[PDB]
Every structure is written in C-alpha cells, then in structure tokens.
Swiss-Prot record, chain A:
Attaches the virion to the cell membrane by interacting with host receptor, initiating the infection. The major receptor is host ACE2. When S2/S2' has been cleaved, binding to the receptor triggers direct fusion at the cell membrane. When S2/S2' has not been cleaved, binding to the receptor results in internalization of the virus by endocytosis using host TFRC and GRM2 and leading to fusion of the virion membrane with the host endosomal membrane. Alternatively, may use NRP1/NRP2 and integrin as entry receptors. This is Spike protein S1. The chain holds residues 461 to 509 of 1273 of the full protein. Binds to host ACE2. RBD also interacts with the N-linked glycan on 'Asn-90' of ACE2. Cleavage of S generates a polybasic C-terminal sequence on S1 that binds to host Neuropilin-1 (NRP1) and Neuropilin-2 (NRP2) receptors. Interacts with host integrin alpha-5/beta-1 (ITGA5:ITGB1) and with ACE2 in complex with integrin alpha-5/beta-1 (ITGA5:ITGB1). May interact via cytoplasmic c-terminus with M protein. May interact (via N-terminus) with host bilirubin and biliverdin, thereby preventing antibody binding to the SARS-CoV-2 spike NTD via an allosteric mechanism. Changing V23A: Increased resistance to neutralizing antibodies. Disulfide bonds join C20-C28. Changing T18K: In strain: Delta/B.1.617.2, Omicron/BA.1, Omicron/BA.2, Omicron/BA.2.12.1, Omicron/BA.2.75, Omicron/BA.4, Omicron/BA.5, Omicron/BQ.1.1, Omicron/XBB.1.5, Omicron/EG.5.1. The lineage of its organism: Viruses, Riboviria, Orthornavirae, Pisuviricota, Pisoniviricetes. Changing S17N: In strain: 20A.EU2, Iota/B.1.526, Omicron/BA.1, Omicron/BA.2, Omicron/BA.2.12.1, Omicron/BA.2.75, Omicron/BA.4, Omicron/BA.5, Omicron/BQ.1.1, Omicron/XBB.1.5, Omicron/EG.5.1. Residues 1-30 are annotated as: Disordered. Residues 1-48 are annotated as: Receptor-binding motif. Changing Q38R: In strain: Omicron/BA.1, Omicron/BA.2, Omicron/BA.2.12.1, Omicron/BA.2.75, Omicron/BA.4, Omicron/BA.5, Omicron/BQ.1.1, Omicron/XBB.1.5, Omicron/EG.5.1.
Amino acid sequence: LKPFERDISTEIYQAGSTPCNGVKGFNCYFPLQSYGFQPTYGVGYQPYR
Amino acid sequence: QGFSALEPLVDLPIGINITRFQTLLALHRSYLTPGDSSSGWTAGAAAYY
Amino acid sequence: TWFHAKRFANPVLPFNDGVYFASTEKSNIIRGWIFGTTLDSKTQSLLIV
C-alpha cells in the first residue's frame, strides 16, 4: 500500500487469474485476521494502544 | 487567453485514492414532463471543460 | 475536451494524477463535482454539490 491509505473495502481475496467466491476457497485466503488478546499473552503479543 | 492566477480556497485533506471523476449538470426543464434525463429535458446551452 | 451542456455530457473520466476544469456559462447550471474510486456504496466516493 501507499502510505496514508485505508483498506476499508472488505472483499474476498483472489490469487490472481482465478476468480473465487464464498467465504473459503483454494488459493483464496481471507485478508482479515483477528487478535485474541488475553492476559495470558506475553511480551510482543501484548496489545498496545 | 489572458493569464491564470489560480489561488487556493479549500485545501482540506481527505485521504482517498481517486480513480474516477464526474460532474453534475443539474439540468432541468418544464415540470409538466418529468424527463428524468431520458431524452432532452435540458433547457440549457452551457459548456464545461 | 469540449463538453457543452446542450446535449447530455456527463462522461466518467480517469483522475490522471490531477485534473483541470473550466466552464463559461451565463447561468449557475453546474453544481456537482462528484469523485470516487468507483462511485459506489462499497468504496468511499467524494460528493461535491
């Protein structure tokens, strides 16, 4: 990405030259990934504001 | 021809990677016929560049 | 490009790293300058009226 830009338009990712749909598919991984922040996390995994 | 002396009036950042550009003619005609920009319904002879 | 307002003249144009605009008119016909990456509800689209 160019600096100072946001990827707010959520969409199903494609590997290129391979259309895909739904929620899961081969060569199609969901762009988003959550953070299961818990106190059991150690350093580095600590969420920082 | 003359000359150009353009001056800034609004300089507020937004932060969007813009790819398109369109303008609104705001054309209108008689209220009797609701053309809705189908054919004619302009009643104007202005221009823009 | 001459975009006289007699006929329908509202073509979507690429935002080629900048843009210029001018308009001679004996009226206040032109009102809107909508922008946007795709002019859709999904992506953010700038609307100027």
